[model samples]
Target chain A: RLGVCGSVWGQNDIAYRCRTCENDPTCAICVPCFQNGDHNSHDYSIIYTGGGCCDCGDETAWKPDGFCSNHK
Target chain B: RLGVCGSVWGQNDIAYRCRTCENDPTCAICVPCFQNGDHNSHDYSIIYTGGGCCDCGDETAWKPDGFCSNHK
Candidate 1:
């Protein structure tokens, strides 16, 4: 949970996109990030995509200071 | 371009998510599919994820008969 889940395979990865963190609509978190992060209360949407980066620490993806602890 | 542009690497691929095709929020299309598809008039969002399938021909992802010709 503490490790960087890093980039995942866009064609095969299952990710959680936080509707609560809609600053960047494209932002999403991997399974590990979702499990370890504090997103339980957030409204999230499931996304299947060809490719893109997880937004755990991406400044554009989240509001200020929204990076998960592992990503931060 | 007409080939099955199957699954893409979620962490490395850049895909198109159509806001108009919200039937399946997880649905997305690969670049090739997007290029040859008829998504010009739809409201869409870009997504970055770990892995997921392109929703071009997926019945659940699109409205009735909404698949692009390439996918249909």
Candidate 2:
């Protein structure tokens, strides 16, 4: 991301997060935060971004007998 | 799939979808339907499964600065 300076990553910025953040439920952060002094040495995982948290399992993806690719 | 099942693929069974259903919105089907004459010649796409439709993009796959790997 060289020469890519202007704005830094924010909370909703999809990135690996240490779920056991001290980890609260749905607690997470961006790559910068994941590598921060606050969370550079714990454990984290992956997640999609919603306007809020990661329950954003949304879009066109379907589940087993659940939402359909054309139900929304 | 020889002698390997009792239930046929249900609706939300992680499948390919022809976004252009007649085709309606969130329209899709399992591999079986994908190979059927009903939707054998339409354009479809990939979607994650959910509890009622295809917006099931649920999982740990973090987005680029959106959700985290540990988000709920």
Candidate 3:
């Protein structure tokens, strides 16, 4: 099933770090958000690190095009 | 060159997430620390996430044996 950022509390879920959209190296989006978001051309990496929240909807963290449908 | 967590500020560096030593899923260590540390039998993952510091020396986050030489 699809998911949102805050719903999972950013635990051990899959996280996608986007170099193109991120102003900082740490900017990340959850798998669900990433799959549904618009970032096909962006350089990114997949990781399962935790202890932080998703950056899908944060305008300061992600570019407008990178924001997921749920976040937009 | 081998690296440590705080030294690099955990920005876009390789991170090792140990399921065995971690009390929480977010617990993580940098590559240098992980390679030099005692976790041959531990279950772990490699990721490139950022924006957070390493959990190497945090006793509350990792088990006693998981602590690296620098952390110990």
Model number with the top lDDT? 3
State the C-alpha RMSD over the true interface residues for candidate 2, after superposing those residues. 15.8
Task: Please report the interface RMSD of model 3 to 1 decimal.
Answer: 11.2
Can you give the TM-score per candidate against the true fold?
A: 0.41, 0.25, 0.43
Write one digit per residue (lDDT tens) for candidate 2, span A1-72: 000111233445564444444224543344443332233344556655443432112222212122112222
Residue B67 of candidate 1: its Cα lDDT?
54
Using lDDT as the measure, name the better of candidate 1 and candidate 3: 3
C-alpha lDDT (0 to 100) for residue B7 of candidate 2? 17
Q: Residue A57 error for model 3, in Å?
A: 21
Tell me each candidate's i-RMS in Å.
11.2, 15.8, 11.2
> Once model 2 is optimally superposed onto the true structure by TM-score, how far is the C-alpha of residue B33 displaced, in angstroms?
1.1
Instruction: Give the residue spans of candidate 1 off by over 4 A.
Output: A1-6, B1-72
Residue A12, candidate 2: Cα error in Å is: 52
Best first by DockQ, ranked: 2, 1, 3
> How well is each residue in A1-72 modelled by candidate 3, as lDDT tens digits?
011245343466678888988869877777788876657688989988574777876778777567664454
True contacts kept of each: 0.00, 0.07, 0.00
Q: Write the residue-wise lDDT of candidate 1 on B1-72 in tens digits.
A: 101336555676678877776476677877666665456688876667567777666666765344543454
The CAPRI classification for model 1 reads as: incorrect
Instruction: Write one digit per residue (lDDT tens) for candidate 3, span B1-72.
Output: 343223233356567888898868766776788887888888899877563456666576667688788767
